[PDB]
Design a protein around this motif. Sequence first.
Motif, short mmCIF file in Angstrom:
data_model
loop_
_atom_site.label_atom_id
_atom_site.label_comp_id
_atom_site.label_asym_id
_atom_site.label_seq_id
_atom_site.Cartn_x
_atom_site.Cartn_y
_atom_site.Cartn_z
N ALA A 100 3.25 -0.01 11.31
CA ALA A 100 2.69 0.78 12.40
C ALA A 100 1.30 1.31 12.11
O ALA A 100 0.91 1.51 10.96
CB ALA A 100 3.63 1.94 12.73
N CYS A 101 0.54 1.54 13.18
CA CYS A 101 -0.81 2.05 13.07
C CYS A 101 -0.93 3.32 13.88
O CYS A 101 -0.75 3.30 15.09
CB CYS A 101 -1.82 1.02 13.59
SG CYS A 101 -3.54 1.56 13.47
N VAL A 161 -7.34 6.84 11.47
CA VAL A 161 -6.51 5.64 11.49
C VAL A 161 -5.70 5.50 10.20
O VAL A 161 -6.25 5.43 9.10
CB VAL A 161 -7.40 4.40 11.65
CG1 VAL A 161 -6.53 3.16 11.80
CG2 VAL A 161 -8.30 4.57 12.86
N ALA A 162 -4.38 5.47 10.34
CA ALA A 162 -3.49 5.33 9.19
C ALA A 162 -2.52 4.17 9.44
O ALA A 162 -2.03 3.99 10.55
CB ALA A 162 -2.71 6.62 8.98
N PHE A 163 -2.25 3.39 8.40
CA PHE A 163 -1.34 2.27 8.55
C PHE A 163 -0.23 2.33 7.52
O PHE A 163 -0.49 2.50 6.33
CB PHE A 163 -2.12 0.96 8.45
CG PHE A 163 -1.31 -0.24 8.81
CD1 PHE A 163 -0.34 -0.73 7.95
CD2 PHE A 163 -1.50 -0.86 10.04
CE1 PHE A 163 0.43 -1.84 8.31
CE2 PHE A 163 -0.74 -1.96 10.41
CZ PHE A 163 0.23 -2.46 9.54
N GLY A 179 7.77 1.20 4.83
CA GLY A 179 8.13 2.59 4.59
C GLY A 179 7.08 3.50 3.99
O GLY A 179 7.25 4.72 3.99
N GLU A 180 5.99 2.94 3.48
CA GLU A 180 4.95 3.75 2.87
C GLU A 180 3.54 3.54 3.43
O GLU A 180 3.24 2.52 4.06
CB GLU A 180 4.92 3.50 1.35
CG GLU A 180 6.29 3.37 0.69
CD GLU A 180 7.03 4.69 0.51
OE1 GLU A 180 6.62 5.70 1.12
OE2 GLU A 180 8.03 4.70 -0.25
N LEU A 181 2.67 4.51 3.21
CA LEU A 181 1.30 4.40 3.67
C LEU A 181 0.66 3.25 2.90
O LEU A 181 0.90 3.09 1.70
CB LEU A 181 0.56 5.70 3.37
CG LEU A 181 -0.96 5.62 3.22
CD1 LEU A 181 -1.62 5.34 4.57
CD2 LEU A 181 -1.45 6.93 2.63
N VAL A 182 -0.16 2.46 3.59
CA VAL A 182 -0.86 1.35 2.95
C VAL A 182 -2.32 1.73 2.73
O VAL A 182 -2.86 1.57 1.63
CB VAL A 182 -0.81 0.06 3.79
CG1 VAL A 182 -1.66 -1.02 3.15
CG2 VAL A 182 0.63 -0.41 3.92
N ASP A 183 -2.97 2.22 3.79
CA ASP A 183 -4.37 2.64 3.70
C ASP A 183 -4.77 3.43 4.93
O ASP A 183 -4.02 3.47 5.90
CB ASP A 183 -5.27 1.41 3.51
CG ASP A 183 -6.52 1.72 2.68
OD1 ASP A 183 -7.12 0.76 2.16
OD2 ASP A 183 -6.90 2.91 2.56
N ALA A 184 -5.94 4.07 4.90
CA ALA A 184 -6.40 4.88 6.01
C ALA A 184 -7.91 5.04 6.04
O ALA A 184 -8.59 4.70 5.08
CB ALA A 184 -5.76 6.25 5.95
N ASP A 185 -8.43 5.58 7.14
CA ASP A 185 -9.86 5.81 7.31
C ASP A 185 -10.14 6.58 8.61
O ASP A 185 -9.22 6.86 9.38
CB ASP A 185 -10.62 4.48 7.36
CG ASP A 185 -12.06 4.59 6.87
OD1 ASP A 185 -12.66 5.68 6.95
OD2 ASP A 185 -12.60 3.56 6.40
N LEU A 193 -10.01 -2.83 6.24
CA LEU A 193 -8.89 -2.58 5.33
C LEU A 193 -7.97 -3.80 5.25
O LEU A 193 -6.89 -3.72 4.66
CB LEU A 193 -8.09 -1.36 5.80
CG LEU A 193 -8.83 -0.02 5.92
CD1 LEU A 193 -7.85 1.03 6.40
CD2 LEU A 193 -9.44 0.39 4.59
N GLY A 194 -8.40 -4.91 5.83
CA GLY A 194 -7.61 -6.13 5.82
C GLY A 194 -6.17 -5.89 6.24
O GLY A 194 -5.26 -6.53 5.71
N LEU A 195 -5.95 -5.00 7.19
CA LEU A 195 -4.60 -4.69 7.64
C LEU A 195 -4.17 -5.29 8.97
O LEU A 195 -3.57 -4.61 9.80
CB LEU A 195 -4.39 -3.17 7.70
CG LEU A 195 -3.84 -2.56 6.42
CD1 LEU A 195 -3.83 -1.05 6.54
CD2 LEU A 195 -2.44 -3.09 6.18
#
Length: 370
Positions: free
Chosen positions: A195-196, A207-209, A213-219, A304-306
């Motif tokens: 989810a984003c 923006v958080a992704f 179950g866990e945070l991957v990256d944000a900005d 973030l290549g997400l």
Amino acid sequence: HYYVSIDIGSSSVKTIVGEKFHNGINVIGTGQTYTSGIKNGLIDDFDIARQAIKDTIKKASIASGVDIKEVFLKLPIIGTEVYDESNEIDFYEDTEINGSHIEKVLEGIREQETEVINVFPIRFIVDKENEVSDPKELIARHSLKVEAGVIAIQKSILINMIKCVEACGVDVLDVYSDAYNYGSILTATEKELGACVIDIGEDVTQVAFYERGELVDADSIEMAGRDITDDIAQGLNTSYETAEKVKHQYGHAFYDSASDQDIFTVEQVDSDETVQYTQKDLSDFIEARVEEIFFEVFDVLQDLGLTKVNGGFIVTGGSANLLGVKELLSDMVSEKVRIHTPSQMGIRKPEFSSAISTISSSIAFDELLD
Ligand SMILES: Nc1ncnc2c1ncn2[C@@H]1O[C@H](COP(=O)(O)OP(=O)(O)OP(=O)(O)O)[C@@H](O)[C@H]1O
Ligand SMILES: [Mg+2]
């Protein structure tokens, strides 16, 4: 006992005082204070801000009945770092892993310009072999290792954000990056799939992704509510204020769905005259900006290549109150899109998402480490 979170935003400082119940949180008091002391998510005039925070801490200290002296400060995904890290502690006896070993092993990770603010577990590994989610009450013979996720924020933000809140005569028990907080507003299904979270405030859009179950990256992006208003004032040739109102009163982010029958009147800034616009007219400008905002979001995601957001899109924050926002995003993407609003009463407005999640995160760590 009681949980008090403080959200120092560019539009309004927000405070929530809650109580932990079995199936959630019970908001027993909140406060909110508009201020020009914060800009782009950072302190623009310390004194002005320090006064907003105090006022907010008061309005809540009153409405909740509690005499606030301890608070949990949230931090904006600005000058923030999200990386992977692990650490292992040793044993010389047969130890029954308890909440204290979790803290001890996480602390090591909390270890130049930045500072680790949040360390969360991904998975533990007992006696160098048993990979497990929860290691509590399990018996360790040689070691407890944790592979965790870490968030660091620039020392300049941390320091001043706390120097300002503490200047109000209250202690900052802990700090929580919104990059970790948003995990709350999601569902297990969302967190798992990918989810984003898109938090469109006034000056900032975060923006958080999260995946598995866990945070991957944000900005974050320096484009949000204010920019919608700016676009409105110029498009209708009017003051910021009246622009900020018709946005609240008539705002619609999707053209093809705005009314024509709906009419309002704005005064002109260069004459003592007054012009009349429909909701649709206003929509042209609004949608345009909200769109440019989502386009920024996508880029953040690409950087973030997400790619792949099978978990869907969750949008929230003050500007999320805008009508047609869900419509517009869904029209420019192909995943589910919902506008997250706190369930608890009193704080049933999108702008309160961050503040309430700060408490969730608090409580979450309270249990993890006991
Ligand atoms: N009903 C409304 N319709 C559309 N937008 C609105 C409405 N209510 C709030 N807003 C906008 O939302 C923004 C503030 O919401 P928010 O509280 O999330 O920002 P903030 O957290 O205080 O500051 P930051 O940008 O650092 O996050 C303002 O620009 C405001 O104009
Ligand atoms: Mg905000």
